[PDB]
Amino acid sequence: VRDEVAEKCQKLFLDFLEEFQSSDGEIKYLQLAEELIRPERNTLVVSFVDLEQFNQQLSTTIQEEFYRVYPYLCRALKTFVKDRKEIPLAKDFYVAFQDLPTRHKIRELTSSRIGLLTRISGQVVRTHPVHPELVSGTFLCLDCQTVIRDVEQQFKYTQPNICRNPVCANRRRFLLDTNKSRFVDFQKVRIQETQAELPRGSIPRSLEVILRAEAVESAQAGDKCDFGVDGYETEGIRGLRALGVRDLSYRLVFLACCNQMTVKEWEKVFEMSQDKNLYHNLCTSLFPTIHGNDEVKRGVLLMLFGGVPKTTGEGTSLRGDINVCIVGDPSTAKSQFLKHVEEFSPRAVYTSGKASSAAGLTAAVVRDEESHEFVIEAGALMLADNGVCCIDEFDKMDVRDQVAIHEAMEQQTISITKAGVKATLNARTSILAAANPISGHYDRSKSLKQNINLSAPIMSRFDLFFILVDECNEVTDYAIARRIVDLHSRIEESIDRVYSLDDIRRYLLFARQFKPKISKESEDFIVEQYKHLRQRDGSGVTKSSWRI
Amino acid sequence: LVIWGTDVNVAACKENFQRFLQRFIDYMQRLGEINVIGEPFLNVNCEHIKSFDKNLYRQLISYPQEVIPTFDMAVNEIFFDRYPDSILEHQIQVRPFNALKTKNMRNLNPEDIDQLITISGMVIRTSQLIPEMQEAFFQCQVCAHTTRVEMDRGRIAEPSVCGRCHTTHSMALIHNRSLFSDKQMIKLQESPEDMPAGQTPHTVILFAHNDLVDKVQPGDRVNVTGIYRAVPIRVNPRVSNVKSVYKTHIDVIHYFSEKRVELLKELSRKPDIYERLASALAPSIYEHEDIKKGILLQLFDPGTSKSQLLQYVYNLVPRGQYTSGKGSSAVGLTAYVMKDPETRQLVLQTGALVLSDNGICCIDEFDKMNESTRSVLHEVMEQQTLSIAKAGIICQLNARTSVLAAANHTLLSRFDLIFLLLDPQDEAYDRRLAHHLVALYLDMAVLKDYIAYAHSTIMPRLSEEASQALIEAYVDMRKIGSSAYPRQLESLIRLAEAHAKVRLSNKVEAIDVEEAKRLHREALKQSAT
Amino acid sequence: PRLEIHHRFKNFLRGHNVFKERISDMCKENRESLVVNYEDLAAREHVLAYFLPEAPAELLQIFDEAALEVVLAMYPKYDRITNHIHVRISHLPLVEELRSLRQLHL
């Protein structure tokens, strides 16, 4: 009964590993073998949609019995080689699937459903190095007893006490079955639930999942996951202990393995072109709640546009981000309050300045013989990877951050090394920051030398700077507060929502994969004029900061 | 196919139900949610039959473990016959909602061994999901054939049965219906209603088996009506001795006046209201009444009537926490996450500042704190939220509340309001101390209702005429008689909302116009010289 | 797995001109060297040559025990030279130039 179903499921899995589509023959098999063995990448894919179409009951059986089908997919599936010489060298296999159109909400992924499927989605938190603790195996002597496929699995030892010549264990022994063991590669990452999907009152729940070698150097710290008995032997014999029950059972135990709507938005861009001075109105359009400081938002407005070239000739990394720092208030009613506007946007980090515990980016040893609180994690900045980061309180980098940010800014990576962990990551994001003086603005009459009293090698690397000069313009000075209070006058005026000010921006994001094929003719024209720019900086205009 | 030992029929009203159908029809939202939505866990309200007949109510609380299943089976069985094309896979459990508030929650007698009771308090700590085995079945030796027998409830899956044939984890997890359940350790704290501070407050362990865990948010007000239970604690795991003391725990099962207000408006138009309210409201407060501006408007030598002033807040509004430094470090206030080495289980500790939302926290002696701390408050003051960044948790906790205090480089602007206690050096002022307090030293219900009920609907709006007044104010008068240029003044609109919150007035009159103007002069003097 | 080679080789514990001079190479001078070519290993006993890539592990225990047998029989005076013999088998073709950096091949 169980034998026939266990055989037929394996049969219907094996026969489907070769597709009928994609031509025919054995040329494709040779191509897949070349693509797999030669680089030893171990990457394979099979369409789950077609498998479900062939036998949807298969998708239900795997869904309800992953815990039962893992050990048969581990051993029996390996029969695809048809060569006896390559079977003993091979230790483990690797398969995957991409663009799965079936998924389940995490909120519907209750703990009461162990053994089903789940999608690896969330935030990478708490990285761990691989530790080779004893997992599974056996020491049983072949002259005494034969090997049965039921032993250990977890850290527990042998229960049976028959033929007590080696069974007596009141003596230390180190005979480890290094020949027969399940030791390949294994690590744990504590995925954190997606903050964006989380509400204001979150109380995140920390997932506890085990990741195999497939996770090695494939995941980034701080980013979203985007991939019969005889003789009347009855009970009553002493030897029952509860030490092996409280440890694992109290935790989470599952395994995981790695049209017109579009046009409608785009139509506004094309159609609105016929209106005169479109570019001017576009600039205002993004900042509904700003009064004055048009030059300040001008740099921020441009900061949204991106474009980072990849490395194809194995050369240097061309920098495509923008790093602008704004000089503003003397740190009283800080005009950095404009930073709060940018918060209303996805892919951003609500930096708590720097004067904070900041367990991230300061990774520490995790193995004080039972556990450690500090983990190997630099999420403090990397959390905005593939996004834009807004860092507040930039003037609090006196000691700890000064070394830190310099390495991050220049190299776009973090070299954490504490004698047990060493790796480099990718922190690709722009840095939006604002800096204020220590006690006020006094470099108007005094030279900047030693007066600004900040760290040059960091501010030097910054792209642009901004100055906020107040003018006795009574038209705008009176209207500064009025525009603020106007949101209180919603009784007689309601603003209709024609378009989302964020959705339109993200349309440009996907435009990057499309090719601009910009000719050189338009490009060099600015370059030719750029010669004039470098000379005219020395024309004697009012100086603020000599950069050149 | 039924046992008469308990004498429980179906609702005890089957014969009365036919006439109930034809008489009661001749609160729609309760009936309509069932048919249209198809939402499980029916959420019936308080037993209103207790107003009609006590005997029917008294029979549903004496043995509630034998009553809830009766409601669940009866409601489902009728739907099965009437609606064969419904979802019978998702069981529906009828749940009491806002049941009878047990009298003398302080005095919970052990006599009521198994009865619904209603605790009222708060949530201190919550545990991570603890799975448990439910509806366990055994394993035979005759061809490993299991016959369904244990369908009827009442059996107990005792432990130590699985110290042999551990295959039950892999094998009987699914096929013998042994999927892990959900349970959460929850510790409530009883609220003694401003007790004279006699006996210590009782802790309650709320950790029952029911899978409704976390569908109710912890960290709120507690109105959880639960079922008392008692279990025998083993003296030692090694032996089978059991002591004659049982741990309490509570089962998780849960999902005229306006005439007075009109009077207050009529007397409000009198021009002597300012003296009448100041004299009657908080009369235990000594001189230096300029401090009262922060207290009176917002709510409605150190410790020189100062620390005591904080005690008034703690006495008046129980919603809050009072704490101080020099005895607690930075980790001593929050993010104290720690596990128990004796039991080997982790606890996701929180802190008091975290729990301080919708209130005013009492922190004094702020100058004596170290620079290492004061970091968490800094974000709160500048972002109105509290972010907790530890290895386990990286997020922000809502801090939609206000905290204010008083003090004694120009980077002080971080504070919301700064006032300095000045000494008028007038001995006559101290004279009133002996007569005012020493000589001198039903209504409590009235003062309570002012905040909760009346303020719930009141939301002021700013007219057009009242906005520009402060803007044109500071510009002209600042050069007469010789920092205002920051936008700090504009923020004063927040406190301006207090003026409208008086008299429950959404409109602006002559009163509270010059009141805001003089506030500049009081702030100007303490910043002068 | 097999039985023909195991017992014979275990009983072994109970071009050669260079070997003749190299076995005496170690002396009181303590040059501390042991150079053995891999091709000679297949030449002397060919049954081991196929077992080298399958079960090399047992050779480590055998090598240390086997060295004492020859030396003790000849001259007990030589016993006090470093009090250790190290296995110094030469290369075993195969050769991974870049793919050796894998934990799958333990």
Q: Any idea which residue has 């044939």 for tokens?
A: B165
CA distance, residue B106 to nearest chain A CA (Å)? 31
How big is chain C, counted in residues? 106
Q: Which of C9, C13, C18, C17 is nearest to C50 (CA)?
A: C9
Nearest to A298 by CA among A313, A312, A286: A286
Instruction: Kindly list the residues from chain C whose CB atom is less than 8 angstroms away from the CB atom of residue A142.
Output: none
Could you give the CA distance from residue A410 to residue A439 in angstroms, rounded to a whole number? Answer: 29
Contacts of A454 (CB under 8 A, 6+ apart): A395, A435
Chains B and C touch (3+ CB pairs under 8 A): no
Report helix, strand and coil shares of chain B as percent, to nearest 5: 35, 10, 55
Beta bridge partners of B319: none
- Give the containing element (helix H, strand E) for A64: helix A56-64
Spatial neighbors of B314 by CB under 8 A, at least 6 apart, are B320, B322, B362
> Taken in order B130, B136, B140, B146, is the CA torsion positive or negative?
negative
| Residue showing tokens 């408006």 | B265
Does residue A389 contact residue A430 with C-beta atoms inside 8 Å? Answer: yes
- The answer to whether B95 and B198 are in contact (CB under 8 A) is no
Q: Using CA atoms, how far apart are residues A424 and A415, in angstroms rounded to an integer?
A: 5
Q: Work out the minimum CA distance from B335 to partner chain A, whole angstroms.
A: 10
DSSP B129-173: PB--B-S-----SSTT-----TTSS-----TTTTSS-GGGTTSTT
B518 in a labelled binding site: no
Q: Is A183 on the interface with C (CB under 8 A)?
A: yes
Between CA C69 and CA B384 the distance in angstroms is 82
CB contact under 8 A, B141 and A489: no
CB environment B173-204: b (16+ within 10 A), e (fewer):
beebebbbbbbbebbbebbbeeeeeeeeeeeb
Per DSSP, which regions of B276-378 are E strands?
Answer: 322-323, 338-340, 345-347, 362-363
Nearest to C103 among A89, A179, A185 (CB): A185
d(CA A479, nearest CA chain B) in Å? 10
Nearest Cα neighbor of B208 from B224, B223, B222, B220 is: B224
- Count of CB atoms within 10 A of residue A304's CB? 15
CA A240 to chain B, closest CA, distance in angstroms equals 6
Name the DSSP class of A143: T
Look at the alpha carbons of A423, A428, A434, A437 in this order and tell me if their dihedral is positive or negative: positive
Q: How far apart are CA B74 and CA A436, in angstroms?
A: 71
Q: What is the token pair recorded at A372?
A: 């450690």
Chain A residues within 8 A of C105 when measuring between CB atoms: 89, 91
DSSP letter at A376 equals B
Distance CA B336, CA B351 (A): 7
**Residues in CB range of B53: below 8 A, 6 or more apart:** none
Closest CA to B313 of B365, B359, B381: B359
Sequence-distant (6+) residues with CB within 8 A of B389 are A352, A356, A357, A358, A359, A360, A380
Give the CA distances from residue C8 to residues B22, B147, C2, C38, in Å, rounded to whole numbers and listed in that order: 100, 58, 12, 21
Place of tokens 């576009």: A282
CA distance A304 to B280: 58
Return the SS3 of A111. Answer: helix
Chains sharing 3 or more CB pairs under 8 A with chain A: B, C
* Euclidean distance between CA atoms B509 and B506, whole angstroms: 10
A436 annotated as a binding-site residue: yes
Q: Is A273 annotated as a binding residue?
A: no
Q: Are B149 and B189 in contact (CB under 8 A)?
A: no
Q: What is the DSSP letter of B70?
A: H
Contact assessment for residue B204 and residue B185, using Cβ atoms and an 8 Å cutoff: no
Pick from A202, A439, A195, A485: nearest CA to B466: A485
Alpha-carbon distances, residue A283 vs A302, A320, A468 (angstroms): 9, 22, 19
State the Cα–Cα distance between residues A209 and A217, nearest whole angstrom: 17
Q: Please indicate if any CB of chain A lies within 8 Å of the CB of B201.
A: no
User: In chain A, what residues touch B398 (CB-CB under 8 Å)?
Assistant: 200-201
CB atoms within 10 A of CB B319: 13
Q: What span, in angstroms and rounded, lies between the C-alpha atoms of B227 and B61?
A: 10
Q: Please list, residue by residue across A415-429, b when 16 or more beta carbons sit within 10 angstroms of its beta carbon and e when fewer do.
A: ebeeeebeeebebbb
Q: Residues with Cβ < 8 Å from C20, sequence gap 6 or more?
A: none
Q: Which helix (H) or strand (E) holds C10?
A: helix C4-11
Which pair of structure tokens corresponds to residue B412?
Answer: 């002080």
Residue B269 in tokens: 């138009």
Q: Which of B493, B451, B486 is nearest to B468 (CA)?
A: B493
**CA of A184 to nearest chain C CA: how many angstroms apart?**
6
How near does any CA of chain A get to the CA of B487, in Å?
6
Confirm if B432 and B287 have CB atoms less than 8 A apart.
yes
Q: What are phi and psi of B54, to 5 degrees?
A: -75, -30
- Of B251, B308, B304, nearest to B421 (Cα)? B304
Q: Give the E-state strand segments of B411-524 in sequence order.
A: none
CB spacing of A484 vs B490 below 8 angstroms: yes
Best of B349, B374, B379, B490 to disrupt the A interface (most A CBs within 10 Å) is B379
Two structure tokens written together for A527: 């370059």
Which residues 230-289 of chain B have a CB within 8 Å of chain A?
Answer: 237
DSSP three-state, residue B340? strand
Q: How many CB atoms neighbour CB A164 within 10 A?
A: 8
Quick one: DSSP state of residue C104? Answer: G
Distance from the Cα of A265 to chain C's closest Cα (Å) equals: 49
Strand pairing class (B362-363; B322-323): parallel
| Cβ–Cβ under 8 Å, residues B39 and B32 | no
Q: Closest partner residue to B462 among A355, A357, A485, by Cβ?
A: A485
B82 contacts chain A (CB < 8 A) = no
Whether residue B494 is annotated as binding a ligand: the answer is no
DSSP state of B35: I
The H or E element that residue A284 is part of is: helix A278-285
Q: C104 vs A184: CB contact, 8 Å cut-off?
A: yes
Query: Tokens 């999942």 map to which residue?
Result: A209
CA torsion through residues A495, A498, A503, A505, sign: negative
Which segments of B61-126 are extended strands (E)?
116-118, 121-126
Contact A123, A194 (CB under 8 A): yes
Task: Evaluate whether B264 touches B256 at the Cβ level (below 8 Å).
Answer: no
Under DSSP, the state recorded for B398 is E
The response to whether A332 counts as a known ligand-binding position is yes
Q: How far is CA B421 from CA B291, B367, B408, B523, in A?
A: 9, 15, 6, 12
Q: Tell me whether A48 touches chain C (CB under 8 Å).
A: no
H helices present in B231-369, as ranges: 257-268, 273-280, 292, 298-299, 307-316
Q: Report whether B192 contacts B106 (CB < 8 A).
A: yes
Cross-chain Cβ contact B180/A229 below 8 Å: no
* Phi and psi based region of residue A132 (left: phi greater than 0; alpha: psi -120 to 50; beta: remaining): beta
Q: Cα–Cα distance between C61 and C51 in angstroms, integer?
A: 15
Residue A87's φ and ψ, nearest 5 degrees, are -75, -35
- Nearest Cα neighbor of A337 from A383, A403, A292 is A292
Q: Is B224 exposed, middle or buried (0-12, 13-18, 19+ CB in 10 A)?
A: buried
Specify the 3-state DSSP secondary structure of A435.
Answer: strand
Torsion of CA B423, B426, B432, B438, to 10 degrees: 60
B307 appears as a binding residue in the annotation? yes
Residues of chain A contacting residue C53, judged by C-beta atoms under 8 Å apart:
none
User: At B246, is the secondary structure helix, strand, or coil?
Assistant: strand
- φ, ψ of residue A343 in degrees (nearest 5): -60, -35
Q: Is there a contact between A333 and B486 if contact means CB atoms under 8 Å apart?
A: yes
- Tokens 């191509």, residue? A31
Suggest the residue from A72, A188, A332, A371 to mutate for an interface test with chain B (most B CBs closer than 10 A). Answer: A332
**CB-CB under 8 Å, B218 with A360:** no
The answer to whether the beta carbons of residues A117 and A63 sit under 8 Å apart is yes
Chain breaks in chain B (C to N over 2.5 A) after: 26, 255, 300, 408, 441, 482
Specified resolution (Å): 4.3
The answer to whether residues A162 and A141 touch, using CB atoms and an 8 Å cutoff, is no
Q: Which of B487, B493, B506, B507 to mutate to test the interface with A (most CBs of A within 10 A)?
A: B487
Q: Compute φ and ψ for B109, nearest 5 degrees.
A: -70, 145
Which residue from C minimizes the CA distance to A88? C54
At which residue do the structure tokens 């001109």 appear? C17
Measured distance CA(B337)–CA(B350) in Å, rounded: 7
Would you state the structure tokens that stand for residue A192, as one six-digit string?
A: 């954190």
Report which of B417, B443, B435 is spatially closest to residue B519, judged by C-alpha positions: B417
Helix (H, G, I), strand (E, B) or coil at A411: helix
Query: What gap in Å lies between CA A351 and CA A374, rounded to an integer?
Result: 20
Element at A53 (helix H, strand E): helix A48-54
Under a CB-based contact definition with an 8 Å cutoff, are residues A117 and A59 in contact?
A: no
Q: Do B179 and A112 touch (CB under 8 A)?
A: yes
Q: Helix-strand-coil percent breakdown of chain A, rounded to 5?
A: 30, 10, 60
Q: In B304-438, which residue ranges form alpha helices assigned H by DSSP?
A: 307-316, 375-383, 427-433
**Residues A384 and A347: beta-carbon distance below 8 Å:** yes
Which DSSP helix (H) or strand (E) runs through A433? strand A430-435
* Cα A358 to Cα A403: distance, rounded to the nearest angstrom: 15
Burial A18-37 (b: 16+ CB within 10 A, else e): eeeeeeeeeeeeeeeeeeee
* Cα–Cα dist A414/B196, whole Å: 58
Q: Which residues sit directly before a break in chain C (C to N > 2.5 Å)?
A: 14
Contacts of residue B185, Cβ cutoff 8 Å, sequence gap at least 6: B125, B126, B127, B130, B205, B206, B207
Please list the alpha-helical segments (H only) found in B34-89: 49-52, 54-58, 68-82
User: C46 is written with which tokens?
Assistant: 């060919």
- Separation of alpha carbons C57 and C48, rounded Å: 12
Neighbouring residues of B192: CB distance < 8 A, sequence distance ≥ 6: B106, B201
Residue in the structure block whose two tokens are 């060297």: C33
HSE-CB for B400 with a 13 A CA cutoff: 3
What is the rounded distance in angstroms from the CA atom of residue B41 to the CA atom of residue B93? 5
B164 class by beta-carbon count within 10 Å (0-12 exposed, 13-18 middle, 19+ buried)? middle
Closest-CA distance of chain B to residue A539, Å: 35
Best mutation target among C58, C101, C103 (most A Cβ atoms within 10 Å) is C103
Q: What is the 3-state secondary structure (H, E, C) of A313-330?
A: CCCCCCCCCCEEEEECCC
Q: Can you say how many angstroms the Cα of residue B511 is from the centroid of all Cα atoms in its chain?
A: 37
Q: Is the CB of A242 inside 8 Å of chain C's CB atoms?
A: no
CA atoms within 13 A on the CB side of B475: 10
- Please state how this structure was obtained: cryo-EM
Residue B489 neighbours by CB under 8 Å, 6+ apart = B470, B471, B474, B520
Q: Which residues of chain C are within 8 Å of residue A213 when distances are taken between CB atoms? A: 103-104
Cα–Cα distance, A473 to A477 (Å, whole number):
6
**Residues 13-72, chain C: which have Cβ within 8 Å of A?**
57
Name chain C's partners: 3 or more CB pairs within 8 A: A
